[PDB]
Coordinates of C-alpha atoms and ligand atoms in Angstrom, one line a residue:
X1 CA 3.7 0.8 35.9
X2 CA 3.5 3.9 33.5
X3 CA 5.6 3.1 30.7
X4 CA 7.4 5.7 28.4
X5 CA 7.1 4.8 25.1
X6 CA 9.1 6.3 22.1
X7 CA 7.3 5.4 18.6
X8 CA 8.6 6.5 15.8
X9 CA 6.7 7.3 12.5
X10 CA 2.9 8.7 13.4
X11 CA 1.1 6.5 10.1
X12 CA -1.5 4.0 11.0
X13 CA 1.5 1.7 12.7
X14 CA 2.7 4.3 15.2
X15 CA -0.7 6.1 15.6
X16 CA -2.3 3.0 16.2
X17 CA 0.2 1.3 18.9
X18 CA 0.0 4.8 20.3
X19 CA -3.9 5.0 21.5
X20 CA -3.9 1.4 22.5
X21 CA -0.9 2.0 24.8
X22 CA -2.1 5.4 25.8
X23 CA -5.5 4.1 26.7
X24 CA -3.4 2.0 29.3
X25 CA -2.0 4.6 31.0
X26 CA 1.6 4.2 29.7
X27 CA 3.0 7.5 28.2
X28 CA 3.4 7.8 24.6
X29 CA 6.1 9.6 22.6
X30 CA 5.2 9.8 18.8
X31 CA 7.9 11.6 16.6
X32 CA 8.0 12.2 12.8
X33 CA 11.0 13.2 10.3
X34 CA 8.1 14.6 8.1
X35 CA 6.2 18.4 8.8
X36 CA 3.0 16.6 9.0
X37 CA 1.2 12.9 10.4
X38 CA -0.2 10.1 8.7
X39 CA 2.7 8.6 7.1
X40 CA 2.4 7.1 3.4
X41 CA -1.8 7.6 3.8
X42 CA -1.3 11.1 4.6
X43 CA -3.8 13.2 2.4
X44 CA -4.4 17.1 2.3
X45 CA -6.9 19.2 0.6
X46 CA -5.3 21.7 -2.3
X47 CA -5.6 25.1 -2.0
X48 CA -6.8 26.1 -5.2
X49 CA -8.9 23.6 -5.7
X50 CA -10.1 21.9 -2.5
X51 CA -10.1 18.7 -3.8
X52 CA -8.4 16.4 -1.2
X53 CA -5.2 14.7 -2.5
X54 CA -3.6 11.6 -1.8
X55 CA -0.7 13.1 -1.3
X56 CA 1.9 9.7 -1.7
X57 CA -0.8 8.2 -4.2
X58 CA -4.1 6.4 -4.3
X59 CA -5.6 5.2 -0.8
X60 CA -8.7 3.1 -0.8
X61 CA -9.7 1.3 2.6
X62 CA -11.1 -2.5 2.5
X63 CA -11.3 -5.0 4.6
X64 CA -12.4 -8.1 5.2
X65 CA -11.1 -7.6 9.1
X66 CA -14.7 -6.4 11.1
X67 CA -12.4 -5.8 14.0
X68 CA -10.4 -3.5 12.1
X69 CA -13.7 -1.8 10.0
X70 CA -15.3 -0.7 13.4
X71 CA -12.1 0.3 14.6
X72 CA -12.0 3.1 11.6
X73 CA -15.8 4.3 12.1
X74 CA -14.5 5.4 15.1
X75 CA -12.1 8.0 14.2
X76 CA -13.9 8.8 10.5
X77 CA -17.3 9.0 9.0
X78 CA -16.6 6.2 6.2
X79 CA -17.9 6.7 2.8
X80 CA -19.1 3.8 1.0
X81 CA -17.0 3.5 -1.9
X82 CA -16.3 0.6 -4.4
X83 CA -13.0 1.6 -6.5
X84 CA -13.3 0.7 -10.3
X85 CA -10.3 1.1 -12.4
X86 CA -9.7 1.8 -16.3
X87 CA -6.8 0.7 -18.1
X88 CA -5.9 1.8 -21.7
X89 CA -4.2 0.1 -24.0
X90 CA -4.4 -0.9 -27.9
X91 CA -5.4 2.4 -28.0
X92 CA -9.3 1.0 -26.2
X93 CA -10.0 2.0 -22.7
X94 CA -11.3 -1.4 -20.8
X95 CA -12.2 -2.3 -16.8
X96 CA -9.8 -4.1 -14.9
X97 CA -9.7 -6.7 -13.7
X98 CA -9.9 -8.8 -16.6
X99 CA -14.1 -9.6 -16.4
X100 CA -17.0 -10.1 -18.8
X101 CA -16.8 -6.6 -20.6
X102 CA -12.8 -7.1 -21.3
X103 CA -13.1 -10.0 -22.5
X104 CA -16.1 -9.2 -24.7
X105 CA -14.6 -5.7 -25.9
X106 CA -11.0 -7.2 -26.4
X107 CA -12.4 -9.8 -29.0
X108 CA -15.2 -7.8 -29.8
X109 CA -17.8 -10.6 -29.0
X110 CA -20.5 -10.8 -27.2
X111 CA -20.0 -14.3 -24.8
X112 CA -21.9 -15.4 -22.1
X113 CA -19.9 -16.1 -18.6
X114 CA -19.7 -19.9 -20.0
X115 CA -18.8 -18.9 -23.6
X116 CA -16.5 -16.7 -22.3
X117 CA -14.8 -19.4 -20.1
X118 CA -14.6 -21.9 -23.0
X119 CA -12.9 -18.5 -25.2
X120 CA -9.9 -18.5 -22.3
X121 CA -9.5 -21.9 -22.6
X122 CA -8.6 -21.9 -26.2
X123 CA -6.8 -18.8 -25.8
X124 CA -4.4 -20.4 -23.2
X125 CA -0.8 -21.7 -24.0
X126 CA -1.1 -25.3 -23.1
X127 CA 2.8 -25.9 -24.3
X128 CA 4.0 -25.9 -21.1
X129 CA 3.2 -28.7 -18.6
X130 CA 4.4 -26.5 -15.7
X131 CA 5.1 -23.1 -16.3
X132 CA 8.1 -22.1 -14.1
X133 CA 7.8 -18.3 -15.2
X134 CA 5.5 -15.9 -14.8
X135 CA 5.4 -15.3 -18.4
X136 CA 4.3 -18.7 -19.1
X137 CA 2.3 -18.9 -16.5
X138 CA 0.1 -16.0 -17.6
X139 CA 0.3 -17.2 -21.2
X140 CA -1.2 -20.5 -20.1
X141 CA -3.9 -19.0 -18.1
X142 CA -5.0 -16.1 -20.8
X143 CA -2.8 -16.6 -23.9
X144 CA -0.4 -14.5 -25.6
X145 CA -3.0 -11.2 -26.8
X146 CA -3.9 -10.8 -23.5
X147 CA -1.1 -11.7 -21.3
X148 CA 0.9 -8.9 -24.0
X149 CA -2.2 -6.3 -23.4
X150 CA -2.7 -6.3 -19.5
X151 CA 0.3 -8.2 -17.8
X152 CA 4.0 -7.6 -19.8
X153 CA 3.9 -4.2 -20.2
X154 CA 2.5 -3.3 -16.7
X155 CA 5.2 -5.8 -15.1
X156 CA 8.1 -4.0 -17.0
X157 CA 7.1 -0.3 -16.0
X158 CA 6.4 -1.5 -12.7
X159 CA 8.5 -3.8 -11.4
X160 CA 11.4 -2.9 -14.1
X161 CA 11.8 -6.4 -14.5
X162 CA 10.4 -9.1 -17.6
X163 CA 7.9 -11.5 -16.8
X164 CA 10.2 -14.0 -18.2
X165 CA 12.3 -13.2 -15.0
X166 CA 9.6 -13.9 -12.4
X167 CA 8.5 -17.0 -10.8
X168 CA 5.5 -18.4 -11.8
X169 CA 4.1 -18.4 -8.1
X170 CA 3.7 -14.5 -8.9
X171 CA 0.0 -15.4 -10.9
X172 CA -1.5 -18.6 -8.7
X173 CA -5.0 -18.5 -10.4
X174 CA -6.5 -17.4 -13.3
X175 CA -6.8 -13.4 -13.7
X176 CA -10.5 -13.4 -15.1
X177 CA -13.7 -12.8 -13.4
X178 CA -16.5 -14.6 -15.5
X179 CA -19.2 -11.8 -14.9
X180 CA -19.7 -8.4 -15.2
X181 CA -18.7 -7.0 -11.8
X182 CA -16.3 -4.7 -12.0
X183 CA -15.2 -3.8 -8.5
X184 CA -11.6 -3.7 -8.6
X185 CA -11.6 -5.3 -4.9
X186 CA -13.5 -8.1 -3.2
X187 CA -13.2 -6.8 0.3
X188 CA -16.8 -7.0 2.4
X189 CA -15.7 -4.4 3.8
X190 CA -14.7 -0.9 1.4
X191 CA -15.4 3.0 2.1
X192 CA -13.7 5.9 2.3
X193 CA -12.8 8.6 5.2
X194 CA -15.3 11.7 4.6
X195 CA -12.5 14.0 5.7
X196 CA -9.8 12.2 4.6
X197 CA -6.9 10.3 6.4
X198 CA -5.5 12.8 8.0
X199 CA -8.5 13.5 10.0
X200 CA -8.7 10.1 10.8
X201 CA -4.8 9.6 12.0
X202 CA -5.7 13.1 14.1
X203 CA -8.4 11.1 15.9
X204 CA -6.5 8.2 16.6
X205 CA -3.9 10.0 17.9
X206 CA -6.2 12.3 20.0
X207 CA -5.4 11.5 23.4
X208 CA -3.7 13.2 26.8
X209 CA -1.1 10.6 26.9
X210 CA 0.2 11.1 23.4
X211 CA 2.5 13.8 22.4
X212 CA 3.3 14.4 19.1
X213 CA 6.8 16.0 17.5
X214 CA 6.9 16.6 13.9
X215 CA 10.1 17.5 12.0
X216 CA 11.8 15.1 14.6
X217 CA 14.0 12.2 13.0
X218 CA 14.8 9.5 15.1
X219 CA 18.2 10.0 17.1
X220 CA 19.4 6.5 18.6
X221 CA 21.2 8.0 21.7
X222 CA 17.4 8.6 21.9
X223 CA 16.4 5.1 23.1
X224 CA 17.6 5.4 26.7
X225 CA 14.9 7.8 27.9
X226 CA 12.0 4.9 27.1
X227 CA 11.1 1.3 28.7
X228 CA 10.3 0.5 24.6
X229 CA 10.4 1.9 21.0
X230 CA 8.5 1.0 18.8
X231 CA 10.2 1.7 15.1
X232 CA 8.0 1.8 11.8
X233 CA 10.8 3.6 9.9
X234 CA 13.5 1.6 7.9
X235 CA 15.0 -1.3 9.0
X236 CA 18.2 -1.0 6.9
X237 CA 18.0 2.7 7.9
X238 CA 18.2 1.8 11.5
X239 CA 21.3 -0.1 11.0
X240 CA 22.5 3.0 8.5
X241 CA 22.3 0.8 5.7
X242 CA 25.7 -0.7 6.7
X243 CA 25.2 -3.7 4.4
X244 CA 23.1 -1.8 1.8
X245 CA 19.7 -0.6 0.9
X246 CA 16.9 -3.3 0.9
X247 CA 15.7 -3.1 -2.7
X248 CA 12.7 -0.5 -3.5
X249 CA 10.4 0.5 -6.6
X250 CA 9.8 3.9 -5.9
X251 CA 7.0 5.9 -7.4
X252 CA 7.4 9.5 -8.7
X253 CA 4.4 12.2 -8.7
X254 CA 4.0 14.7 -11.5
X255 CA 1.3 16.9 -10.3
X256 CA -1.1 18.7 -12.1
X257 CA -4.4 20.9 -12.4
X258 CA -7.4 20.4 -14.8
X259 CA -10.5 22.5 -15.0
X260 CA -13.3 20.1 -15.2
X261 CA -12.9 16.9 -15.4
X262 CA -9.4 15.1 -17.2
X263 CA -10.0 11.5 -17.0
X264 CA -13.4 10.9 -15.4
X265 CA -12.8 8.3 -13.4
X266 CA -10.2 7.8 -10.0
X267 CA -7.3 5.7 -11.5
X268 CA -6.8 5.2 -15.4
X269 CA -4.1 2.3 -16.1
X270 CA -1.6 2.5 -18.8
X271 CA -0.6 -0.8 -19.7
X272 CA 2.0 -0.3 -22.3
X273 CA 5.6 0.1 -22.6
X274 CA 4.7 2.9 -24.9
X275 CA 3.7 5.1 -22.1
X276 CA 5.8 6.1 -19.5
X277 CA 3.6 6.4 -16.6
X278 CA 1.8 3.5 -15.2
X279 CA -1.4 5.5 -14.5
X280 CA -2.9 8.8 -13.9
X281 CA -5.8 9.3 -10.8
X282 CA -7.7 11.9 -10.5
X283 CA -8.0 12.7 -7.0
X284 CA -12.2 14.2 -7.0
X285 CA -13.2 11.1 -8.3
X286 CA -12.2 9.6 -4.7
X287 CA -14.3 12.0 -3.0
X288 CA -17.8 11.5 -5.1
X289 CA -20.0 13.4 -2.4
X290 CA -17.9 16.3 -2.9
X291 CA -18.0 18.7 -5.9
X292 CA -15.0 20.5 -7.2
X293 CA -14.7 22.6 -10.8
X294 CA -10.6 22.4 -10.6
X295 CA -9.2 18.9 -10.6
X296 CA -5.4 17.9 -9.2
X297 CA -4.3 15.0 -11.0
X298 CA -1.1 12.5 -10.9
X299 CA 0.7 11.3 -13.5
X300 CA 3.0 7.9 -11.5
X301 CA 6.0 7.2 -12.8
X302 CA 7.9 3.5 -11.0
X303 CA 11.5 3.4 -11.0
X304 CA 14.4 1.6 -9.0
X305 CA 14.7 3.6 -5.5
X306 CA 17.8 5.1 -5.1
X307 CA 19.6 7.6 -2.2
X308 CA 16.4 9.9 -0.4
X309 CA 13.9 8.3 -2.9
X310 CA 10.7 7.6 0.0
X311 CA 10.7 3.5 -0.5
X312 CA 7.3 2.5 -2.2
X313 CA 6.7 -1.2 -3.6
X314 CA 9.4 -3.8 -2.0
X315 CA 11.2 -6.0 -4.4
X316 CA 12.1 -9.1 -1.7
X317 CA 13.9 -11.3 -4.3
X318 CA 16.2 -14.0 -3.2
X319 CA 19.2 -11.4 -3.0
X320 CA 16.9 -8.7 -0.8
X321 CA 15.5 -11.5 1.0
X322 CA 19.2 -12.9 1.9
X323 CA 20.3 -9.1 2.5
X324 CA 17.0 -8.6 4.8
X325 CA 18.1 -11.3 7.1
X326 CA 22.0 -9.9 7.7
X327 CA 19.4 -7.3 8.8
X328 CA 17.6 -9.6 10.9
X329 CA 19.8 -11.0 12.8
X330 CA 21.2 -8.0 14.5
X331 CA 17.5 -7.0 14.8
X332 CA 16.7 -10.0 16.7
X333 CA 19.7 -9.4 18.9
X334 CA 18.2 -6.1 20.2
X335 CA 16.5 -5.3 23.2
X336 CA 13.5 -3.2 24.4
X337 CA 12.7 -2.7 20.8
X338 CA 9.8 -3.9 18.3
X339 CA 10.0 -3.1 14.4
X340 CA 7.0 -2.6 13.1
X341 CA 4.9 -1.9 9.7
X342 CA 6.0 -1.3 5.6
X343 CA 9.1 0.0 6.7
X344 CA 9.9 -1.8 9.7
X345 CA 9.6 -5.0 8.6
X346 CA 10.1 -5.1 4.7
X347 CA 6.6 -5.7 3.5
X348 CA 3.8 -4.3 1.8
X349 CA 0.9 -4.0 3.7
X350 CA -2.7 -2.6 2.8
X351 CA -4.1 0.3 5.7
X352 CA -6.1 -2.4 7.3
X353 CA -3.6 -5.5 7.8
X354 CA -1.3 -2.8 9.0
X355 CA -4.3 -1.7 11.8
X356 CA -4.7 -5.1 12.5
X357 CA -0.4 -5.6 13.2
X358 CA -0.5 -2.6 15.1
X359 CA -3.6 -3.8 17.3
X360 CA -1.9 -6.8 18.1
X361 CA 1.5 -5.4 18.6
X362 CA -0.4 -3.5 21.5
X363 CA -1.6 -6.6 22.8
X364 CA 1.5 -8.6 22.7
X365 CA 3.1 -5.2 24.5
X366 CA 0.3 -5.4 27.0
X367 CA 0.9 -8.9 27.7
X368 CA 4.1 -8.6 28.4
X369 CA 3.7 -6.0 30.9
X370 CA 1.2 -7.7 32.8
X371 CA 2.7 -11.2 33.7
X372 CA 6.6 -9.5 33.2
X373 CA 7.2 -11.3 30.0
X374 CA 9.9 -10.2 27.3
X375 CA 8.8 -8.2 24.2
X376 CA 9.6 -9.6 21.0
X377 CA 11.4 -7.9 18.4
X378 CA 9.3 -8.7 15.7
X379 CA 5.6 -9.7 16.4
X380 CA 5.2 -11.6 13.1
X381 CA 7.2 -13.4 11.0
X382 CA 9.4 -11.2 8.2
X383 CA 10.9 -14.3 6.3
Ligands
FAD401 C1 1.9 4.1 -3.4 C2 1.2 3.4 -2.3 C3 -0.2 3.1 -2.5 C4 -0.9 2.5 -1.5 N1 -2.3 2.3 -1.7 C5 -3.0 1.6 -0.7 C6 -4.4 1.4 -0.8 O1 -4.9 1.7 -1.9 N2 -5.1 0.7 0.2 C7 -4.5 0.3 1.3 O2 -5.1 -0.3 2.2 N3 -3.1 0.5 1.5 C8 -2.4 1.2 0.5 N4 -1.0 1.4 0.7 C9 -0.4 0.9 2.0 C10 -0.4 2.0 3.1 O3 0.3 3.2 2.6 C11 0.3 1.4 4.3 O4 -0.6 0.4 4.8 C12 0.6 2.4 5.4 O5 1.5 3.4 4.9 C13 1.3 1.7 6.5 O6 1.6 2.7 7.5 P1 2.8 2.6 8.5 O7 2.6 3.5 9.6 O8 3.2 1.2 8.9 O9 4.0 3.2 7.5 P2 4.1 4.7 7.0 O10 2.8 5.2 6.5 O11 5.2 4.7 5.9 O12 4.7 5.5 8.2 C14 6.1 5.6 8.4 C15 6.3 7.0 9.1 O13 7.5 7.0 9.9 C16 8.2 8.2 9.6 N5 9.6 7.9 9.8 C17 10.4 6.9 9.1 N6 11.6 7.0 9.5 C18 11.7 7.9 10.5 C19 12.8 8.3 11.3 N7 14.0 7.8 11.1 N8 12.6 9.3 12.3 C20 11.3 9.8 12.4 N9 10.3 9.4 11.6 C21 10.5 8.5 10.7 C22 7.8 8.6 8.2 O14 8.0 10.0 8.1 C23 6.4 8.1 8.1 O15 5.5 9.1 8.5 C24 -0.3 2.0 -0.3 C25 1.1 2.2 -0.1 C26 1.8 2.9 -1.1 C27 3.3 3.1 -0.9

């Protein structure tokens, strides 16, 4: 059996699902509110400038998933690329994460990786036997100059909330790295698309059996014409938010041209209050085998997502949480349906864990079909 498929949102979830069902046989319908694919990794190059842009902020692929790392080299020439982030504050620029060099430049010292550990030791708030905030959990893991430095002021801007309201499950280890590596991520696997993400999305979705319709929202009546839709939009938008929005940080964009070079590096952090964007990138500085004279930059500003704000950074407190599963459990009373992705599910999820979800979405699909089983709503757990 053929199936017709209707999957909605053409990002990595939809595009994804797509090819693998396509590949199958089935016959895939992929429709997108937005002019253009690739979802919240959809990137463009500027006119002006040709740099390419993130265009809904910073993307940088890693894995530790080789599954999911072959599955990109595929559809993209991959770049290596380690990201490295800068973060200013007390008016010094220092590398984040928290390593060797911070450490050493913040006290102006000149400790070894031992010294150093012996340093955050002393510099920890051992008052509290067991820190039930996140505030006291950071103060006993770095003390109170640091945890004021690199971890209040970043919190309040970006989650607009004090670490004194956060549970101390938030920070389970100790932010320092006692060396001087300063590769912001740990990934084995880390690169970035030569032609962007775009171009990638393109290949994945480069197949006979997939049609694609942008400026095209989602019309339920819709649902009748397909065997199964697959839904990576809004899950309280599904329902028309008839018990509320699920809570949302969104992130604002002021763009921006430079000639030369503004920052010098991808992503510079601003960890104070005192500033009211939580970084600037530099979009180039992502591409580093390219060359380009004129420089687009981003200023991102966080704030509390309100009516046709796009949904960023989910807050999934105890009172989203409990609103999600009102959500839920008309979800899981629906039939011929599978949410899937950020949206879909209520979750943030890095490019790769979503390719891996999407992968085994397919699967589970597959499955189904072959033995005459009955697709799940959900294909992994959203509590
Ligand atoms: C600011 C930010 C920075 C990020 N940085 C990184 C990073 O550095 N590295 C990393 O690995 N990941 C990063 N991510 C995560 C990455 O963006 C996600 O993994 C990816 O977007 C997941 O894709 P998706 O297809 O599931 O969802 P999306 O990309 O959001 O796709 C949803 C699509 O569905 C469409 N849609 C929604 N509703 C409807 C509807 N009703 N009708 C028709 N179409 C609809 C939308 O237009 C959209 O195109 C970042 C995310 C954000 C928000």
């Amino acid at each position: 059996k053929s199936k017709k498929i209707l999957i909605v949102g053409a990002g990595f979830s939809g595009a994804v699902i797509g090819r693998q069902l396509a590949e199958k046989g089935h016959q895939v319908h992929i429709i997108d509110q937005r002019d253009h694919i690739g979802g919240n990794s959809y990137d463009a190059r500027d006119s002006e400038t040709n740099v390419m842009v993130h265009v809904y902020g910073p993307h940088i692929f890693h894995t530790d998933n080789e599954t999911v790392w072959n599955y990109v080299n595929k559809h993209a020439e991959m770049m290596p690329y380690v990201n490295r982030v800068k973060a200013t504050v007390n008016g010094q620029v220092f590398s984040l994460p928290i390593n060797l060099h911070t450490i050493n430049q913040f006290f102006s010292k000149t400790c070894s990786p031992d010294e150093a550990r012996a340093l955050i030791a002393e510099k920890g708030d051992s008052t509290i036997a067991d820190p039930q905030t996140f505030e006291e959990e950071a103060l006993r893991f770095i003390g109170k100059e640091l945890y004021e430095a690199f971890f209040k002021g970043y919190t309040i801007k970006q989650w607009g909330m004090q670490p004194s309201e956060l549970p101390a499950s938030i920070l389970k280890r100790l932010p320092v790295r006692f060396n001087y590596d300063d590769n912001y991520f740990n990934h084995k696997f880390q690169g970035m698309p030569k032609c962007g993400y775009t171009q990638m999305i393109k290949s994945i979705l480069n197949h006979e059996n997939i049609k694609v319709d942008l400026q095209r929202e989602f019309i339920v009546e819709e649902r009748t014409h397909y065997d199964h839709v697959f839904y990576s939009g809004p899950l309280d938008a599904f329902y028309g938010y008839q018990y509320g929005r699920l809570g949302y940080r969104t992130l604002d964009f002021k763009k921006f041209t430079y000639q030369g070079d503004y920052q010098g590096c991808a992503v510079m952090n601003y960890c104070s209050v005192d500033v009211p964007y939580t970084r600037i990138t530099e979009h180039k500085y992502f591409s580093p085998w390219e060359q380009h004279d004129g420089s687009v930059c981003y200023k991102e500003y966080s704030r509390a997502c309100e009516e046709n704000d796009i949904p960023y950074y989910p807050i999934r407190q105890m009172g989203e949480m409990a609103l999600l599963e009102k959500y839920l459990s008309l979800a899981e009373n629906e039939t011929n349906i599978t949410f899937v992705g950020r949206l879909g599910t209520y979750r943030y999820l890095d490019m790769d864990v979503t390719i891996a979800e999407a992968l085994k979405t397919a699967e589970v699909y597959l499955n189904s079909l072959t033995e005459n089983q009955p697709m799940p709503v959900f294909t992994v757990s959203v509590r």
